[PDB]
A paper describes a structure:
The covalent modification of target proteins with ubiquitin or ubiquitin-like modifiers is initiated by E1 activating enzymes, which typically transfer a single modifier onto cognate conjugating enzymes. UBA6 is an unusual E1 since it activates two highly distinct modifiers, ubiquitin and FAT10. In the presence of Mg-ATP, E1 catalyzes the acyl-adenylation of ubiquitin, initially forming a ubiquitin-AMP adduct. Subsequently, the E1 catalytic cysteine attacks the ubiquitin-AMP intermediate to form a thioester bond between the cysteine and the C-terminal glycine of ubiquitin, resulting in the formation of a covalent E1~ubiquitin adduct.
Since extensive initial crystallization attempts with wild-type UBA6 did not result in well diffracting crystals, a chimeric protein, referred to as UBA6chim, was utilized. In this protein the SCCH domain (residue 623 to 889) of UBA6 was replaced with its counterpart (residue 631 to 889) from human UBA1, resulting in a protein with enhanced stability. The overall structure of the UBA6chim-FAT10 C0 complex revealed that FAT10 covers the AAD, IAD and 3HB domains of UBA6chim and engages in numerous interactions distributed over a smaller and a larger interface involving the NTD and CTD, respectively. While T133 engages in limited van der Waals interactions involving its side chain Cβ and Cγ atoms, more prominent hydrophobic contacts are formed by L155, F157 and A159 of FAT10 with F316 in the IAD as well as F925, V934, and, to a more limited extent, T936, which are both located in the AAD. Second, the C-terminal tail of FAT10 is threaded underneath the crossover loop towards the ATP binding site with the C-terminal G165 being in close proximity to where the α-phosphate resides in the UBA6-ATP complex. The UBA6chim-FAT10 structure clearly revealed that the same binding pocket used by Uba1 to recognize R72 of ubiquitin is recruited for the binding of Y161 of FAT10. In contrast to the polar interactions involving the recognition of R72, Y161 is recognized predominantly by hydrophobic interactions involving H599 and H614, which are replaced by Asn and Ser (N574 and S589 in Uba1; N606 and S621 in UBA1). In contrast to the hypothesis that the NTD of FAT10 is placed in between the AAD and FCCH and interacts with these domains (see “Comparison of the UBA6 and Uba1 structures”), it is oriented in such a way that it exclusively interacts with the 3HB inserted into the IAD. These interactions are polar and primarily rely on the electrostatic complementarity of a positively charged region in the NTD involving residues K55, K58, R60 and K61 and a negatively charged patch in the 3HB formed by E320, E324, D370 and D374, with S64 of FAT10 and N318 of UBA6 contributing additional polar interactions.
Author numbering:
A (entry chain A): 52 to 797, 823 to 988, 992 to 1030, 1035 to 1050
B (entry chain C): 7 to 81, 87 to 165
The structure:
Amino acid sequence: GDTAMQKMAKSHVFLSGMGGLGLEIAKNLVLAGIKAVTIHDTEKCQAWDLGTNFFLSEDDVVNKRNRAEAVLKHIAELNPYVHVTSSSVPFNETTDLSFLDKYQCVVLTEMKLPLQKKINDFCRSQCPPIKFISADVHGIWSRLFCDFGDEFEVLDTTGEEPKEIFISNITQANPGIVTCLENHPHKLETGQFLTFREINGMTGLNGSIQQITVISPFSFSIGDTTELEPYLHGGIAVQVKTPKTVFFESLERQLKHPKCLIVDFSNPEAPLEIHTAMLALDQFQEKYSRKPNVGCQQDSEELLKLATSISETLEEKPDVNADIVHWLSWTAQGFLSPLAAAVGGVASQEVLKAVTGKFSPLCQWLYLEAADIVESLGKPECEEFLPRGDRYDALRACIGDTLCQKLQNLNIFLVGCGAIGCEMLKNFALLGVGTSKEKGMITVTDPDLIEKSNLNRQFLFRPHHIQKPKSYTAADATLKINSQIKIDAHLNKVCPTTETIYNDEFYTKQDVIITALDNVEARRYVDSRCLANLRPLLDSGTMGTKGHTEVIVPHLTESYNSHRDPPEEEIPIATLKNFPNAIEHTLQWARDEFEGLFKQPAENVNQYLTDPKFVERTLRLAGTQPLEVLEAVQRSLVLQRPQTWADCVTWACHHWHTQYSNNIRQLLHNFPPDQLTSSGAPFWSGPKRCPHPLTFDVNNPLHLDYVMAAANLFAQTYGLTGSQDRAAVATFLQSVQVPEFTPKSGDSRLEELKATLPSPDKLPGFKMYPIDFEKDDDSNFHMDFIVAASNLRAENYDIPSADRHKSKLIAGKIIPAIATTTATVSGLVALEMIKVTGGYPFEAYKNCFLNLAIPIVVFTETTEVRKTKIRNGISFTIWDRWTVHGKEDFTLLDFINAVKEKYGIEPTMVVQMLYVPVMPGHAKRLKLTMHKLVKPTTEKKYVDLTVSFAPDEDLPGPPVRYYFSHD
Amino acid sequence: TLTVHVRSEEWDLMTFDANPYDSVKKIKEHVRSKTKVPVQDQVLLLGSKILKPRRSLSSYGIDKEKTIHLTLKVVELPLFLVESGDEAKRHLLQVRRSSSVAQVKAMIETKTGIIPETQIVTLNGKRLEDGKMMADYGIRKGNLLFLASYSIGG
């Protein structure tokens, strides 16, 4: 066969009409790697086009160049491996359509419906059929159409690589049960097809394709195996990809009976109503050779008449929606660049689906809208939406000058200059965000640099930019889109260390915050920061075809931290411990080890010293494994406690020998390499790999790298210093001697452990310091440990090594961004951003989870605020924070009383543990003065503390901020 | 602002404040406070035209009227719903209008193996949330419930 990428490399595309929409499509397609993209337009540039088109320039409008031919050079630069060809050939009923035969797909924008029909008829007639996609954006309303032909074959629906399964046994019968390895389960559907290869016994099944039915989980019936010989061992099955045929109808047939996907199920009949209106607009242009003028009652009425007439011609009758028609007549002359970017992304992906068959296509129509952006304006004045001659006239005709002015003065904080961030900046510039010199300021920050990429290459970044900061480069590139835009580019990462740089003042000055991140931790840190300063947050994510948008407004919605996360799929326990097959296994095992060595032991010991009841809690927990925790504590306390960095180094050398030689050798003693399983098949077969233990070498850098990282980290856990001297560790390692290994064939002690364990009083001022993992900071050694630990484990199981950069990406499970999804997500996030700057109600804001592979777009209203109340108290949102002003001389009792006196609820305890009733000397803690009780050590004006009220158990409360001085 | 009048064969005339932009559902909620209570009974009509609940008064061409009037009328508790998976994996579940939201999430847990506490579903474009009833959300036969997983990248 030929791959989806190979198919794009052989395929040519024809795009007509180069407004904002035609460009957005061309951009994404050329970045994707289409062999040839033939741009075509007939009109010459105009000052209005500067608002919609991000490559056009003031110079081009004066010279009256053809829209396409002015932007061809800037588009071709995007992807130099693609042949972009311009065309000015006039398009009429006269013009022959024979020149379109060469193109595999044809995309039409800004074209009459009659001419579009004629082309559609020609495209679907040809053999093989030429695929047809029509997209237009008039005002805040859009239309998208797909007609790939009467029959279209989708070669790959899931878009995933075919699965491989390992067979434990096949019964000889008709329905002969086939059961997979107990270790390796299969997720198969009752209709799927498998091809079996390298089976023992049933030699006939090696070249056969059988349908399988899963009547019982983890088993299936392939067919009649009674004739065939009996199965012994082995048997790998490969999923067979089966094409899915979807049928299409011509444009003329679909207008009369449209088949639209529903974006928002709240308004299920909304797409058909839009179809009626959009089709009326086309008739209005045909009858009067112009678009409806804004605020003209005659035009708005005539359109409603047409829409009323069309509603009769439609199959299901629908009832016309007057609100939609009215808004269409007003905005018909305008162009909303973010909606265009969103429609552009989707439309683009459909083209790829047509030349590749990589996903199931759109079924005919898709109507997207920004009605939520205008509905909240009520019934506004028509004078607002009149053109003033500037570049933003197109936007003004959609949202009115009032909201345009709010955007111009905005102060946005863009966290992350990745693919989403770069698109966001282009969407900002067309919208005119932060273009007013007096007030507006966009602040964008990203700490990373640019990479060669070559594939999945970004449109702002170019080759000569390689190894130059992302944010700086984008900012400089963005100004070329809109000169008036004001951007403050920074290289600082948004994390606790920079909280001084991005202080509470900064967040309060910023009117909106937008996140373009790839890790959840940073999302939570930004969400928390925005909650304290009571500012909104706009999050987005891209995972291949899938994307998501979450809008968080102050006091109207919940936060990102509230929204909880499901556990990711777990690599089978035991497969990670003893049978790794891939670098993904060793990398994950190292992270499992890191927490099991440098974090969890330290917390267990610190918990033993702090809690006198720790001993009871652990006895109660998980019988038969309290012994394991207890012995692990006594080991860290006594046996393995290092008093010197050399003791840390010896512990690293002894640990390296146990994980990569002794533990291996005992597994081999249990499961020797010659050993065979039931059915006389080798045990180290297929997914299982025979390891070979390693021998420590000072000269080998992997061996040294492990010791050097482990010891410096081990020292941190106990508070010791580290030296970081390789030669010193090397020479010393020769001197140390390691205990010999002996493999093994295979509660009175638990009482002994209770006695042996040193009582906490006996160990004074001893504390251990858990380490939390941070990939970013390479001077930590945190990542250095992981890379070594994985690559060394790979050596043992004959798995290929993993570089630093490769391993980092594998650990992040980061997916390369795709231009279709990012452009879509970024347009939607931009649209919501308009609603926020307007201060719109909760109802207007709508989140969105989309997947272009299906395709399905889901619009949902945002999650409402959830107020939490304690018995006989007032309810408090997440956004609320309680503030207490004190005197310089105060007590915790005088505070607790003051809490009940203001709000009507009194705290049982207070955390920063500062005071518990159960704690001994609770009357001492309650008499303590406030400056002695809490020591900021910076004589801070205020201190933030937690509060809890118990009606059974204690229940949290909203954060409390106390001011030492009333002032 | 507006005043809306409701004529009923077996019930008293109802007059209350209203807004043209507000939905017919909002009018039915306004009716509930003044008389009869709940909207499930209500099936509003004007002349010969049926009035859909989601559509606004302005969607039916109401304009330049200080006050408007409508003729209210009264007309399968267990229904079939199909629950869409994270990756093109539909399921069949039976629900009733009088079902607690947690009960329905528990059905998803058996079907998908996803704990109901952390389940994320969207029904008729409204996030499916705890402490609610299916009737409150508004459910009709043939509706679809969508399961979603959050995406990270870019």
